[PDB]
Design an enzyme around this catalytic site. Structure first.
Site, PDB file in Angstrom:
ATOM      1  N   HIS A  83      29.941 -41.587  -9.955  1.00 39.48           N
ATOM      2  CA  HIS A  83      28.894 -42.545  -9.645  1.00 39.48           C
ATOM      3  C   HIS A  83      29.530 -43.719  -8.918  1.00 39.48           C
ATOM      4  O   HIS A  83      30.731 -43.710  -8.628  1.00 39.48           O
ATOM      5  CB  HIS A  83      28.007 -42.902 -10.853  1.00 39.48           C
ATOM      6  N   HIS A  85      30.042 -46.978  -9.548  1.00 31.94           N
ATOM      7  CA  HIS A  85      30.677 -48.135 -10.146  1.00 31.94           C
ATOM      8  C   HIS A  85      32.181 -48.118  -9.926  1.00 31.94           C
ATOM      9  O   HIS A  85      32.770 -47.109  -9.553  1.00 31.94           O
ATOM     10  CB  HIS A  85      30.386 -48.167 -11.631  1.00 31.94           C
ATOM     11  N   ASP A  87      34.755 -48.158 -11.795  1.00 35.34           N
ATOM     12  CA  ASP A  87      35.626 -47.246 -12.508  1.00 35.34           C
ATOM     13  C   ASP A  87      35.607 -45.842 -11.935  1.00 35.34           C
ATOM     14  O   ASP A  87      36.344 -44.975 -12.416  1.00 35.34           O
ATOM     15  CB  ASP A  87      35.316 -47.258 -14.007  1.00 35.34           C
ATOM     16  N   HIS A 148      22.921 -43.064 -16.928  1.00 38.43           N
ATOM     17  CA  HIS A 148      23.696 -44.284 -16.822  1.00 38.43           C
ATOM     18  C   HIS A 148      23.521 -44.933 -15.455  1.00 38.43           C
ATOM     19  O   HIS A 148      23.524 -46.160 -15.333  1.00 38.43           O
ATOM     20  CB  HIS A 148      25.155 -43.916 -17.043  1.00 38.43           C
ATOM     21  N   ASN A 179      27.112 -50.387 -20.227  1.00 41.32           N
ATOM     22  CA  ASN A 179      26.581 -51.133 -19.096  1.00 41.32           C
ATOM     23  C   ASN A 179      25.335 -50.415 -18.602  1.00 41.32           C
ATOM     24  O   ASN A 179      25.435 -49.348 -17.984  1.00 41.32           O
ATOM     25  CB  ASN A 179      27.637 -51.199 -18.001  1.00 41.32           C
TER      26      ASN A 179
HETATM   27  C1  LIG Z   1      33.036 -50.911 -14.716  1.00 42.62           C
HETATM   28  C2  LIG Z   1      32.316 -50.012 -15.719  1.00 42.62           C
HETATM   29  C3  LIG Z   1      31.349 -49.095 -14.987  1.00 42.62           C
HETATM   30  S1  LIG Z   1      30.511 -47.859 -16.049  1.00 42.62           S
HETATM   31  C4  LIG Z   1      31.467 -50.822 -16.678  1.00 42.62           C
HETATM   32  O1  LIG Z   1      30.323 -51.111 -16.375  1.00 42.62           O
HETATM   33  N1  LIG Z   1      31.949 -51.192 -17.856  1.00 42.62           N
HETATM   34  C5  LIG Z   1      31.272 -51.937 -18.902  1.00 42.62           C
HETATM   35  C6  LIG Z   1      31.606 -50.977 -20.048  1.00 42.62           C
HETATM   36  C7  LIG Z   1      32.976 -50.378 -19.688  1.00 42.62           C
HETATM   37  C8  LIG Z   1      33.281 -50.935 -18.297  1.00 42.62           C
HETATM   38  C9  LIG Z   1      33.849 -52.356 -18.440  1.00 42.62           C
HETATM   39  O2  LIG Z   1      33.773 -53.123 -17.461  1.00 42.62           O
HETATM   40  O3  LIG Z   1      34.301 -52.630 -19.558  1.00 42.62           O
HETATM   41 ZN   LIG Z   2      29.110 -46.920 -14.545  1.00 45.86          ZN
HETATM   42 ZN   LIG Z   3      32.076 -46.266 -16.620  1.00 45.66          ZN
END
Ligand SMILES: C[C@H](CS)C(=O)N1CCC[C@@H]1C(=O)O
Ligand SMILES: [Zn+2]
Ligand SMILES: [Zn+2]
Ligand SMILES: [Zn+2]
Length: 232
Positions: A83, A85, A87, A148, A179
């Site tokens: 996706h 984001h 990560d 998600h 998130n």
């Molecule tokens: C960058 C990622 C994308 S799923 C995110 O949104 N989060 C929040 C939960 C885990 C990770 C983070 O930033 O800690």
């Molecule tokens: Zn994400």
């Molecule tokens: Zn993630």
């Protein structure tokens, strides 16, 4: 034995062999006063490697490539981001500069562009409709529907029965929906059902963050999403 967020300093990446020719990669980042782990996948593709997802940022992703070189020693020739984001695409430029062909669905590429995130080079066709699946070398890519994120893909390794849910699937220790800024809460349970219906034989289920488990992770995710939906 799975690397926990406490055992990995930010900037370092660990590899974990899940099954023959399948590894997860685990990296960490600080966010909002806590440290979070993030998983991706590595799948042996003959004498090459298919990478699923970056290691959450350029520095981690450079460390990921170095660790793959040291521990596996096969070239990463293709990468898929599941996706949009950071990560999943953060580090796409590092992969691209290392000669990795980077891929994502047009939905992910469009959303990454909207977000100002890194944009994989190649577009994966055939994944625009919920329930669409396409083969990509040693994996099947499946778009289960919005969850998600609207673009989230899951990845199944048929030879190893490994289901990589990415951030659409929550680890057991996660009690919140994570998130949800880009989530489709109303569709997420139905999207999980599509995953359950397509891969009922999965023996390993890898969430986008945290510890792998079995198909129990899917029902856990459903419960967590419903509890979030019912917040009062
Ligand atoms: C960058 C990622 C994308 S799923 C995110 O949104 N989060 C929040 C939960 C885990 C990770 C983070 O930033 O800690
Ligand atoms: Zn994400
Ligand atoms: Zn993630
Ligand atoms: Zn649970």
């Amino acid at each position: 034995e799975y690397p926990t967020v406490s055992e990995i300093p930010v900037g370092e990446v660990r590899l974990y062999q899940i099954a023959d020719g399948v590894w997860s990669h685990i990296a960490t980042q600080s966010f909002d006063g806590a440290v979070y782990p993030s998983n991706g996948l590595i799948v042996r593709d003959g004498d090459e490697l298919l990478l699923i997802d970056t290691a959450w940022g350029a520095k981690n992703t450079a460390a990921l490539l170095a660790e793959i070189e040291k521990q596996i020693g096969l070239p990463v020739t293709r990468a898929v981001s599941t996706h949009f984001h950071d990560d999943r695409v953060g580090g796409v430029d590092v992969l691209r500069a290392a000669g990795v062909a980077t891929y994502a669905s047009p939905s992910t590429r469009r959303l990454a562009e909207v977000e100002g995130n890194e944009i994989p080079t190649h577009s994966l066709e055939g994944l625009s409709s919920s329930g669409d699946a396409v083969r990509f070398g040693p994996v099947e890519l499946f778009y289960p529907g919005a969850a998600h994120s609207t673009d989230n893909l899951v990845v199944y390794v048929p030879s190893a029965s490994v289901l990589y849910g990415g951030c659409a699937i929550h680890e057991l220790s996660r009690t919140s929906a994570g998130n949800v800024a880009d989530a489709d809460l109303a569709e997420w349970p139905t999207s999980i059902e599509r995953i359950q219906q397509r891969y009922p034989e999965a023996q390993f289920v890898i969430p986008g963050h945290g510890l792998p488990g079995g198909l129990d992770l899917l029902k856990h995710t459903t419960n967590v999403v419903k509890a979030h939906t019912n917040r009062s």
